Design a protein around this motif. Sequence first.
Motif, PDB file in Angstrom:
ATOM      1  N   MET A 106      -7.796   0.199   1.377  1.00  0.00           N
ATOM      2  CA  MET A 106      -6.616  -0.318   0.602  1.00  0.00           C
ATOM      3  C   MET A 106      -6.851  -0.806  -0.885  1.00  0.00           C
ATOM      4  N   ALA A 107      -5.964  -0.370  -1.776  1.00  0.00           N
ATOM      5  CA  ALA A 107      -5.742  -0.868  -3.146  1.00  0.00           C
ATOM      6  C   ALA A 107      -5.586  -2.419  -3.349  1.00  0.00           C
ATOM      7  N   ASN A 108      -5.745  -2.819  -4.599  1.00  0.00           N
ATOM      8  CA  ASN A 108      -5.775  -4.211  -4.976  1.00  0.00           C
ATOM      9  C   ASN A 108      -4.441  -4.893  -4.752  1.00  0.00           C
ATOM     10  N   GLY A 109      -3.380  -4.183  -5.161  1.00  0.00           N
ATOM     11  CA  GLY A 109      -1.996  -4.563  -4.870  1.00  0.00           C
ATOM     12  C   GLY A 109      -1.767  -5.000  -3.410  1.00  0.00           C
ATOM     13  N   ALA A 110      -2.245  -4.239  -2.399  1.00  0.00           N
ATOM     14  CA  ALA A 110      -2.084  -4.659  -0.962  1.00  0.00           C
ATOM     15  C   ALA A 110      -2.894  -5.840  -0.478  1.00  0.00           C
ATOM     16  N   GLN A 116       0.839  -1.194   0.000  1.00  0.00           N
ATOM     17  CA  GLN A 116       0.000   0.000   0.000  1.00  0.00           C
ATOM     18  C   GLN A 116       0.885   1.260   0.000  1.00  0.00           C
ATOM     19  N   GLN A 117       1.728   1.345   1.003  1.00  0.00           N
ATOM     20  CA  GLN A 117       2.635   2.429   1.260  1.00  0.00           C
ATOM     21  C   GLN A 117       3.352   2.689  -0.055  1.00  0.00           C
ATOM     22  N   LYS A 118       3.932   1.616  -0.566  1.00  0.00           N
ATOM     23  CA  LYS A 118       4.763   1.640  -1.756  1.00  0.00           C
ATOM     24  C   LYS A 118       4.046   2.357  -2.901  1.00  0.00           C
ATOM     25  N   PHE A 119       2.828   1.938  -3.212  1.00  0.00           N
ATOM     26  CA  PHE A 119       2.227   2.313  -4.491  1.00  0.00           C
ATOM     27  C   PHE A 119       1.472   3.615  -4.381  1.00  0.00           C
ATOM     28  N   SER A 120       0.907   3.855  -3.184  1.00  0.00           N
ATOM     29  CA  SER A 120       0.020   4.993  -2.944  1.00  0.00           C
ATOM     30  C   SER A 120       0.221   5.847  -1.661  1.00  0.00           C
ATOM     31  N   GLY A 121       1.327   5.669  -0.962  1.00  0.00           N
ATOM     32  CA  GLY A 121       1.666   6.632   0.093  1.00  0.00           C
ATOM     33  C   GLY A 121       1.142   6.119   1.404  1.00  0.00           C
ATOM     34  N   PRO A 122       1.548   6.728   2.531  1.00  0.00           N
ATOM     35  CA  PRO A 122       1.371   6.231   3.929  1.00  0.00           C
ATOM     36  C   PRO A 122       0.032   6.466   4.599  1.00  0.00           C
ATOM     37  N   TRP A 123      -0.911   7.006   3.847  1.00  0.00           N
ATOM     38  CA  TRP A 123      -2.220   7.357   4.400  1.00  0.00           C
ATOM     39  C   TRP A 123      -3.260   6.247   4.129  1.00  0.00           C
ATOM     40  N   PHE A 124      -3.534   5.371   5.103  1.00  0.00           N
ATOM     41  CA  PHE A 124      -4.362   4.173   4.851  1.00  0.00           C
ATOM     42  C   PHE A 124      -4.560   3.462   6.161  1.00  0.00           C
ATOM     43  N   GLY A 125      -5.491   2.503   6.175  1.00  0.00           N
ATOM     44  CA  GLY A 125      -5.786   1.850   7.442  1.00  0.00           C
ATOM     45  C   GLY A 125      -6.713   0.707   7.281  1.00  0.00           C
ATOM     46  N   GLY A 126      -6.920  -0.046   8.347  1.00  0.00           N
ATOM     47  CA  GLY A 126      -7.939  -1.080   8.305  1.00  0.00           C
ATOM     48  C   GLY A 126      -7.303  -2.431   8.343  1.00  0.00           C
ATOM     49  N   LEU A 127      -8.109  -3.387   8.755  1.00  0.00           N
ATOM     50  CA  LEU A 127      -7.785  -4.833   8.821  1.00  0.00           C
ATOM     51  C   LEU A 127      -7.997  -5.658   7.525  1.00  0.00           C
ATOM     52  N   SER A 128      -8.312  -5.022   6.334  1.00  0.00           N
ATOM     53  CA  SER A 128      -8.649  -5.623   5.003  1.00  0.00           C
ATOM     54  C   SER A 128      -7.543  -6.532   4.445  1.00  0.00           C
ATOM     55  N   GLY A 129      -6.305  -6.246   4.848  1.00  0.00           N
ATOM     56  CA  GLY A 129      -5.121  -6.987   4.392  1.00  0.00           C
ATOM     57  C   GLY A 129      -5.081  -8.235   5.194  1.00  0.00           C
ATOM     58  N   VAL A 130      -5.319  -8.087   6.487  1.00  0.00           N
ATOM     59  CA  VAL A 130      -5.295  -9.196   7.417  1.00  0.00           C
ATOM     60  C   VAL A 130      -6.410 -10.170   7.126  1.00  0.00           C
ATOM     61  N   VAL A 131      -7.629  -9.664   6.911  1.00  0.00           N
ATOM     62  CA  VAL A 131      -8.794 -10.484   6.485  1.00  0.00           C
ATOM     63  C   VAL A 131      -8.532 -11.319   5.207  1.00  0.00           C
ATOM     64  N   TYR A 132      -7.903 -10.744   4.168  1.00  0.00           N
ATOM     65  CA  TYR A 132      -7.546 -11.487   2.943  1.00  0.00           C
ATOM     66  C   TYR A 132      -6.571 -12.662   3.236  1.00  0.00           C
ATOM     67  N   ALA A 133      -5.787 -12.491   4.284  1.00  0.00           N
ATOM     68  CA  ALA A 133      -4.783 -13.478   4.647  1.00  0.00           C
ATOM     69  C   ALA A 133      -5.489 -14.621   5.334  1.00  0.00           C
ATOM     70  N   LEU A 134      -6.398 -14.306   6.255  1.00  0.00           N
ATOM     71  CA  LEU A 134      -7.352 -15.249   6.861  1.00  0.00           C
ATOM     72  C   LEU A 134      -8.281 -16.049   5.877  1.00  0.00           C
ATOM     73  N   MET A 135      -8.950 -15.364   4.944  1.00  0.00           N
ATOM     74  CA  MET A 135      -9.651 -16.032   3.827  1.00  0.00           C
ATOM     75  C   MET A 135      -8.751 -17.005   3.048  1.00  0.00           C
ATOM     76  N   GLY A 136      -7.636 -16.545   2.488  1.00  0.00           N
ATOM     77  CA  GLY A 136      -6.751 -17.469   1.803  1.00  0.00           C
ATOM     78  C   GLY A 136      -6.261 -18.606   2.701  1.00  0.00           C
ATOM     79  N   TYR A 137      -6.008 -18.312   3.980  1.00  0.00           N
ATOM     80  CA  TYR A 137      -5.469 -19.328   4.883  1.00  0.00           C
ATOM     81  C   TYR A 137      -6.506 -20.422   5.222  1.00  0.00           C
ATOM     82  N   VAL A 138      -7.697 -20.045   5.707  1.00  0.00           N
ATOM     83  CA  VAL A 138      -8.803 -21.003   5.997  1.00  0.00           C
ATOM     84  C   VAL A 138      -9.253 -21.815   4.744  1.00  0.00           C
TER      85      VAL A 138
END
Length: 182
Positions: A159-163, A99-121
């Motif tokens: 968050m963007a698709n990349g993250a 996220q930071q990389k592509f679009s700067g440091p202004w962002f938040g939320g558990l959406s990245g963590v949730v995608y990791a949980l979906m793929g993991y389960v």
Amino acid sequence: ERAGPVTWVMMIACVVVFIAMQILGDQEVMLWLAWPFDPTLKFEFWRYFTHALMHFSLMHILFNLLWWWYLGGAVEKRLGSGKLIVITLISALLSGYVQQKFSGPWFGGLSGVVYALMGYVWLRGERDPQSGIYLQRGLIIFALIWIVAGWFDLFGMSMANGAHIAGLAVGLAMAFVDSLNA
């Protein structure tokens, strides 16, 4: 039912933070919790994680937390508090990073963590039905809905698709790796 200590502490913290944003405003909280946005902030080490705790609408926090309760909760009860702690910190930093990389440091939320949980389960379910962990058919479908809404910017999900793919990759790597060990 009843949800384990990691699952619970994280919901509380996301709520407490969301309240703080309602009271002080978003930037004020971000100022304190966001990914380092100036060089003088690079050694404030909580900021590499605490971006995960800030949400920007009622929907964002609602759906993030529903998923987190159901999936993070399942992972914790079946496979341990330590597993959930590790999925969260890695997925938080890696999606934070992209996220930071592509679009700067202004962002938040558990959406990245949730995608990791979906793929993991999901991938654990497919590769090791035997451990107690799978994503139900119905839920696969609603996960996909939630993903599609994000991917095509149907609901502003911070968050963007990349993250989110970074998040997914972590859940899959770790499911992959766990299903090798069993």
